[PDB]
């Protein structure tokens, strides 16, 4: 038997309903999300890390000169410094005082820390949405499975065939570009590969951490060696990766809306409370019992004994009843006014039972369904004592949930006052116009 | 669970109340004063004899 509905995208809050098949007693259905995961499709653009500058031994040409040639190295530099007269532990290196040349070379390469400490630049597109569900129905206990939130892929959970529809919202916390550094994800608009600027995030770019083709853009400039000293001095813009780590700011992990939790393997946003989830679950035919085979419940009277519109199950009600066969009976409130804690109760030949519920309404008025029967519960609720709680609300507040009977009286009086008063003027106008008509006639 | 009230300044007469906590059965509370003492601050000015 197919049951279709739409449930909110709330993890940890159960969806409860009765599966009503004509000719069979209703079967209570409960579906709870364990987690919801938005898994975007990612494409690694390049890898950024702190650069290392490689400086080969300089060529010191005594009584002569040499020339630089280009080489295929990242940010490669080469400069010939003439007129040098270097000294070492053994004294003057060269004989000639001025006919003396030093050629310096330098280039950029990935640092050794790049194997562990690097940032990954990803292009992010839409992708699969997955969720894990916890499902019960009738006498069947909790069963769970990982499902695809696409409306097409069925899942077999406790012999029931579940199809979960697409989310009502296409929202995703990831922009078209993200940077993954450690466990954190950043919505950073990184420069495209080959366009990085010195001192900024993309100054060093590599397609992979093992790539033999490295892009580097730093102001690596060879400086003239100090007089009499053999070394290869240079100036360079400080690494933009280290600069970025200082200024990277708040990660997506800390600023994502809707309470999203960000995970990296695979990159995904978890438990985002966005929109609703259309669903379709096929309850096995063997789970249904004929009407005549179940207990008959009548003479129902519902009394609310306690009520606070707190986020917890602050309401308590007692239901008096008479029933045949003294069996088990599902309990459900189809109205959005109150969420029932109990799923079913054990009935005697006659007596009463209690149940707990959560409601935002200051004056609850809801229909409680008792297998094959129903009763209306009405009452008043007190305000909660705790200003702040560490758990989410079990109920959904509506527009009129806060309106008290005193407030409704005032609203009705103001509306009734103007309605009657305006109509009186219109009635008076219609009558006087007729009176003038009969004066002429 | 905090219960606030005003009781008369009487010794030997108990203050009785039911502590009503939402969702829980009421707890009877009885507060009685055994003695009350006003202890002023004094400075000895001098001793006469
Ligand atoms: C399903 O709900 C029951 C409630 O008692 C819980 O024990 C079980 O672990 C839940 N399943 C999952 C996968 O969390």
UniProtKB/Swiss-Prot annotation, chain B:
Subcellular location: Virion membrane; Host cell membrane
Membrane topology listed for this record: Single-pass type I membrane protein
PTM summary: N-glycosylated.
Quaternary structure and interacting proteins, as annotated: The precursor of protein E3/E2 and E1 form a heterodimer shortly after synthesis. Processing of the precursor of protein E3/E2 into E2 and E3 results in a heterodimer of the spike glycoproteins E2 and E1. Spike at virion surface are constituted of three E2-E1 heterodimers. After target cell attachment and endocytosis, E1 change conformation to form homotrimers. E2-E1 heterodimers interact with host VLDLR or LRP8/APOER2 to mediate viral entry. Interacts with 6K protein.
Its job: Class II viral fusion protein. Fusion activity is inactive as long as E1 is bound to E2 in mature virion. After virus attachment to target cell via host VLDLR or LRP8/APOER2 and endocytosis, acidification of the endosome induces dissociation of E1/E2 heterodimer and concomitant trimerization of the E1 subunits. This E1 trimer is fusion active, and promotes release of viral nucleocapsid in cytoplasm after endosome and viral membrane fusion. Efficient fusion requires the presence of cholesterol and sphingolipid in the target membrane.
Protein's recorded name: Spike glycoprotein E1
Organism annotation: Eastern equine encephalitis virus
First-to-last residue of the parent protein present: 799 to 847 of 1239
């Amino acid at each position: 038997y197919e049951h279709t509905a739409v449930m909110p995208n709330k993890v940890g809050i159960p969806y409860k309903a009765l599966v009503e098949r004509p000719g069979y007693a209703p079967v209570h259905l409960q579906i709870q999300l364990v987690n919801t995961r938005i898994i975007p499709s990612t494409n690694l653009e390049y890898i950024t890390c702190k650069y290392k500058t490689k400086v080969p031994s300089p060529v010191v040409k005594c009584c002569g000169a040499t020339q630089c040639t280009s080489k295929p190295h990242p940010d490669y530099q080469c400069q010939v410094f003439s007129g040098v007269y270097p000294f070492m532990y053994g004294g003057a290196y060269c004989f000639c005082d001025t006919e003396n040349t030093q050629m310096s070379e330098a280039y950029v390469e990935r640092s050794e820390e790049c194997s562990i400490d690097h940032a990954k630049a990803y292009k992010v597109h839409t992708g699969t949405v997955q969720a894990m569900v916890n499902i019960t129905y009738g006498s069947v206990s909790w069963r769970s499975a990982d499902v695809y939130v696409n409306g097409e892929t069925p899942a077999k959970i406790g012999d029931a065939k579940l199809i979960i529809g697409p989310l009502s919202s296409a929202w995703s916390p990831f922009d078209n570009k993200v940077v993954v550094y450690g466990h954190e994800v950043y919505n950073y608009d990184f420069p495209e590969y080959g366009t990085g600027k010195a001192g900024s995030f993309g100054d060093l770019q590599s397609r992979t951490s093992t790539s033999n083709d490295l892009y580097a853009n730093t102001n690596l400039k060879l400086q003239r060696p100090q007089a009499g000293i053999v070394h290869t001095p240079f100036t360079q813009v400080p690494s933009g990766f280290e600069r970025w780590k200082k200024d990277k700011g708040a990660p997506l992990n800390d600023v994502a809306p809707f309470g999203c939790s960000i995970a990296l393997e695979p990159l995904r946003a978890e438990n985002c409370a966005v929109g609703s989830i259309p669903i379709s679950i096929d309850i096995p035919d063997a789970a249904f019992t004929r009407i005549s085979e179940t207990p008959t419940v009548s003479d129902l009277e519902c009394k609310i004994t306690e009520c606070t519109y707190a986020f917890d199950f602050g309401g308590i009600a007692t239901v008096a009843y008479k029933s045949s066969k003294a069996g088990n009976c599902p309990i459900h409130s189809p109205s959005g006014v109150a969420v029932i804690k109990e799923n079913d109760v054990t009935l005697a030949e006659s007596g009463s039972f209690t149940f707990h519920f959560s409601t935002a309404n200051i004056h609850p008025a809801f229909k409680l369904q008792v297998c094959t029967s129903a009763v209306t519960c009405k009452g008043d609720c007190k305000p909660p004592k705790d200003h702040i709680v560490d758990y989410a609300a079990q109920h959904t507040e509506s527009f009129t949930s806060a309106i008290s009977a005193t407030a409704w009286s005032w609203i009705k009086v103001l509306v009734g006052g103007t309605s009657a008063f305006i109509v009186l003027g219109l009635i008076a106008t219609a009558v006087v116009a007729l009176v003038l008509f009969f004066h002429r006639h």
